[PDB]
Design an enzyme around this catalytic site. Structure first.
Site, PDB file in Angstrom:
ATOM      1  CE1 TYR A 101      -3.046  -3.210   0.848  1.00 21.97           C
ATOM      2  CE2 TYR A 101      -4.601  -1.295   0.840  1.00 21.97           C
ATOM      3  CZ  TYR A 101      -4.364  -2.676   0.780  1.00 21.97           C
ATOM      4  OH  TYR A 101      -5.544  -3.534   0.651  1.00 21.97           O
ATOM      5  CB  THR A 102       3.961   2.332   1.380  1.00 23.62           C
ATOM      6  OG1 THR A 102       3.210   2.236   2.597  1.00 23.62           O
ATOM      7  CG2 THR A 102       4.774   3.622   1.400  1.00 23.62           C
TER       8      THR A 102
END
Lengths: 400, 409, 413, 400
Positions: free
Chosen positions: B330-331
DNA sequence: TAAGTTCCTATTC
DNA sequence: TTTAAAAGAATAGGAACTT
DNA sequence: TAAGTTCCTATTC
DNA sequence: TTTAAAAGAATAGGAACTT
DNA sequence: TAAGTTCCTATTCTTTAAAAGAATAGGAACTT
DNA sequence: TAAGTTCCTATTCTTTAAAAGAATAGGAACTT
């Protein structure tokens, strides 16, 4: 839907319908035992525990794709996510003694010569083009807020109805703001909206989601934001164009006692939303098949926090696993609202000398009462969403 | 090197060469299956995933040291870092049915243990080193004083200007970025850019992708007030070394990067040098930090100045305050070294623990204003003339800036 | 001692001496293989890793008590704390093929009803838990922790046979209480690590380091001025002027002497005489209980003190109970801990700050008076045996504090 | 009671009585081995360790409900909370070789799972919500306390029960303790303890707590219409020492403060005189209301640091080794806690101080007047409760 | 119109 | 996306009597 | 002349 | 008393040449 | 009567292990 | 000369799996 029918069918009846299929061994009958078989394999391996819609859907597909049988040798096999295949095979047999069942693991437990030839192939001439674009999106010029506005904008005219336009923008902004998934927004209990105090913005709107992916409850917020993008405004537009949706049942349990009777959005909203996001592709990332769509908001905020070096918040805000339901620190909203800035050197939130200070405006709004016009502005939610909330929003909106 | 040859050899050929060794069972042939066996055990246990140079090197050594076999009973055993030995043994057999394999966990025999102990008993782990660093620090000298002294120890002792240039550059680079040797070595020379910094005007930024934890990070170079100026050493470095062709570091076969900043073997001579010119006792300790000193120094510097919050970001440490998944998928954006970090390390400013602010040191020369004087300066493309070997490789905008800064002094 | 001899014997020699015992199978020879066997079983199960004195001692006892053998069938068995008995048995055999070894778990699977019953039936009719009973009393009755501390401290005052032993007992006891440390935490202190460290509540305190702790996690040991009749600095003074540095006892088979402390603060055997003393002068009932805490009392007292005051957050740090940079990891005790224990301050639960007692004498100011006149290296003269060992800066500070205490005109000019 | 008889029966006799049941295999005899079997299974799995009344009661019920046997095949089975069923089965057999035992985990087969599901198909969260309601509405904690306290004032059939209910309730609230925390107090441990705010307060000790961690129970003068000392007075003059009930198969304590069955009567009363809705809920907190109330009071006043100490919640700061082995003194409840609860002071979250309420009557000064008889007012406790205590209370009361 | 839904299947978290 | 199931020990409740 | 020691064994952490 | 063991991927070091 | 009691049963809380390693406490014969 | 290189070996960092479950993204074929 199949799952709905499953939930409607009485247990004894299911086992009945399943058994019948094997008395008059018919291809037309045995090939339709997938749903029933799914239910059974679950009930067996979990000793009666209920099964969730999504899980059932998934497993049922897996069984359907693998189901195969010999009517003559009275044998039948299929794949199922389990490791105690034996226990399951046995239990199945007991229900239909004549037959021999074979559960095949869904997960592989890898031959060299294949691995080799495959490597040999690669040698001559990860496949995550999705992660490549996501990096770009953030790597190129535009700031997170610029990207947010652009996406938010892509629906402004491309939408066929005001409702869909309203829904898409609301959902998107909601997901970004709360770093939540589609479901985190959809399963909100409209009756849980409350006005909560925040030392930086005065008050913010808080609602609750219970039916989350990890079954760990979390709060969803809406608050005033400085700039061209104001969550409260989109919440306003949302409320004045949509209506409460009856909470769809999503598990075989028969529990009708305590539970939410409504939900914030429609379960299928995600399909149209993704389809829309796909077409109006504001950025390349959205063109990639199976690339993030409704999720994007999640990834964006997660990145925003990491980039700002505030990963401590990530877990709380995104609702993940760590070592009452944990609430988001006050300053998080201060930041996301844009009325303040994060100072790395001291670690405090510094408001922008911009005239309008959220706190003082809430006070002006909190003062002048006698205006239940909220219930007049949001008729469809009247009696559902706290009047205290509807009045606050209503005021804020009119008051600007 | 062996690993290079491995990468050059076609998969089918490897499996071929391995099988051949067992048709005419020879000691000369079976004893040389280590490299091949390493590759195979990996490919098996990882389903074709590529293997990294360092990992291969390590495992290959482990296999070599443990390989043993009986040509008569057609059996062969060795150690390998794995826990699913069975799956591996089986797969191996399938490739050579006649033989029986036995994988021994890398987790021994008495007589060996003994002779080994007997050895130790006669000749007179990292604790001493940590103590010595604390000493190094807890004595008159400040981090910057220690930095200069080490930097100097190469000034005369070096045999060539290039080596002198390289050692100092590498050392200062490692300290400044709190990076490892590899963090400096694997920089993509083509990624040099000018980036703004509110305290210094602009600083030079480059990118490293092939880091130890595979998490990309940026490497910087900036003007510093005082006797030690990173820009100066960068200048010396560039005018004495040339672009290095990116060494291949994994069996895979494509996100290219044709060059790397330094030579892979630079570390050996660098450590050897640091070892001899031992500016401080710490460097005399066998297995004590060598090229790693830079990293330890800056880590200490920040801690001492009480800014450990930065340490993690600057040293590029996997951050554990955020969910594993929050990270893994997600990053999508390299965390940024905060502007003030450079303000501090540049020495043009100081840190006030109380006011939580950067207090500019009244030194006459103002970094920001000097950049403006330089930025105004146009036409003068003397950069490509001063750094011929990097011309066409390192952004001209960068070469011109550095060139100016240098001449402009 | 046996362990010392083990450390002196060359590995190859040990294996030699062990093997010899089985060539001319003699009861006199096989029955003495305990030490050697202990060493071997360890080296095997740990792949050459060194063995600690205490661990060796323990295991050697266990083997000695269980060793049994048949010289005719060439078999030998014994107990050993391990779960991979097979690997061990095999390795042993390889060293002496003719024989068959059998390792018996010290901790078996572990009973039978009828026994349990008859045992219960016995009890129905009718020193370890009695230990916890007394410890509760000690703290439960009237007396405060400090009152109990003083009373114990005094019990040695007139019962000791020598000034040295008197000095040692009181020092050790007070030291253990003050640092919530074990005997070994005080004994293994490296006398060369004494330093003056600042403390915002007391000015400065004396800090030393212990590396060889039970859990191998290093910790600091302190000594500081305390208001009242019990002053750690005073007992430190008495200690130093009656005892001398002790050569660090080797406590592991490693041959490594390359780097290590050459001195330790107290004598290893001090604990025996200390417990024996504590046992006799039994200031309280608890000390009469066999196997009850003795030298460990200090640790229990402070742990209780902190719990009672509701500061359990400190307990772990102070007692060094197990729970970046290139640094010898040693976690220290927060400044306020000493403020409290020194008695110059009180802990206020409502605000969580330390409040000094309006008592005239304020410690910080006295340190300043002491810090001012130096040049009087009278410390090296007062503590001759530690001169050159303990930092002069420390010896001078203590020396001053002491003189500046009893009184004298030159120390007050 | 059965448990009492168990404690009275000699071990060898128990094993005797158990064995006898299997010599002349009689349904009437084997069906009554529950108590004995419970004892044995415990003694076995715990190597002679004693068993607590409550635990025995629970397990005995579980065994009784599951006990089943075949006199012909000489087999017997039942459920028991254990995971080493084998060790247990074996040990049992050794005592009665002819028979085969089968221990079934307390914590499968389809048809059961099904019928069970079929059952459900046809047919905790509420209570917590109701308490939050109870709290989040005009009435302050003290107002709620008084109201509940009053609900017994007339509804009680006797003065003793009235006295007991009010005492118990106020005691539980004041100490944030459970029923047992009040009931198991050793009447002989009453003392006068200094408090820098109220002069002195009455302190007693409870050893037999749930978590076996001893704690103190207090009683003190309170400003206002509710005075603990007054209710303590009423309590003492209407009830009398209760002989300490034996609570383990095995450390004397000749008396206990209240009767074990008082809780039944008390809950039943609280249930009927339901001063608030919460009390109408089946299985909702009853005697436990007191703790919940204080817990909330402290949290609301923002003093959760005290909650643990006052409520005697197992500490997790100091390690287990620390807590077990080296901790021998009950953590002391801070002086200011009582200052607050007494109502003679208030807490200032900012100045971190106790601000005395200018109420005329000063608690400290009145104690001095008193400090500058009781055995006649409290005859039943004379010789039991410290005279110093009885005299103090007596004075305070008369001096009122 | 298709953007919107509807109800699974395919992929990803 | 996540990752503690269960033994052990109280506090409610049910049913049949008792004052 | 018993408190102190020495060097194991027994217990506890 | 303590309580994550180990796979995976760098950074030192050793030995024999090169300059 | 029906609140108040008995004496279990039903529910709802709270705490959790085992053993390899490594100290500390005690036993005896000796030293001083 | 030995500092500087090769090319492994020896040491010292560092971060971890796998799979059952539970959502989100996409495919085809109807609807406003």
């Amino acid at each position: 839907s199949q799952f709905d029918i499953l939930c409607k069918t009485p247990p004894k009846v299911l086992v009945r319908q399943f058994v019948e299929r094997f008395e008059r061994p018919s291809g037309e009958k045995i090939a339709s035992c997938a749903a029933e078989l799914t239910y059974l394999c679950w009930m067996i391996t979990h000793n009666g525990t209920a099964i969730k819609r999504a899980t059932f859907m998934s497993y049922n597909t897996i069984i359907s794709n693998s189901l195969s049988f010999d009517i003559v040798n009275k044998s039948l096999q299929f794949k199922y996510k389990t490791q105690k295949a034996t226990i399951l095979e046995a239990s199945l047999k007991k229900l239909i003694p004549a037959w021999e069942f074979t559960i095949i693991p869904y997960n592989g437990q890898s031959d060299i010569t294949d691995i080799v030839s495959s490597l040999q192939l690669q040698f001559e001439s990860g496949n995550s083009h999705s992660k490549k674009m996501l990096k770009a999106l953030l790597s190129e010029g535009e700031s997170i807020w610029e990207i947010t506005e652009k996406i938010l904008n892509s629906f402004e005219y491309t939408s066929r109805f005001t409702k869909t336009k309203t829904l898409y923008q609301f959902l998107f902004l909601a997901t970004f703001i709360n770093c939540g998934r589609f479901s985190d927004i959809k399963n909100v209990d409209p009756k849980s909206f409350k006005l909560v105090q925040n030392k930086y913005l005065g008050v913010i709107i808080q609602c609750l989601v219970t039916e989350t992916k990890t079954s760990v409850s979390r709060h969803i917020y809406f608050f005033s934001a400085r700039g061209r993008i104001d969550p409260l405004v989109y919440l306003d537009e949302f409320l004045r164009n949509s209506e409460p949706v009856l909470k769809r049942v999503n598990r075989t349990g028969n529990s009708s006692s305590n539970k939410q009777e409504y939900q914030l959005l429609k379960d299928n909203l995600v399909r149209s939303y993704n389809k829309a996001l796909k077409k109006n592709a504001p950025y390349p990332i959205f063109a990639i098949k199976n690339g993030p769509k409704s999720h994007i908001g999640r990834h964006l905020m997660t990145s925003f926090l990491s980039m700002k070096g505030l990963t401590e918040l990530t877990n709380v805000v995104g609702n993940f696993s760590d070592k009452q339901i944990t609430a988001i620190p006050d300053h998080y909203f201060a930041l996301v609202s844009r009325y303040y800035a994060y100072d790395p050197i001291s670690k405090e939130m510094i408001a922008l000398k911009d005239e309008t200070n959220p706190i003082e405006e809430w006070q002006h709004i909190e003062q002048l009462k006698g205006s239940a016009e909220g219930s007049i502005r949001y008729p469809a939610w009247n009696g559902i969403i706290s009047q205290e909330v509807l009045d606050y929003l209503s005021s804020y909106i009119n008051r600007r």
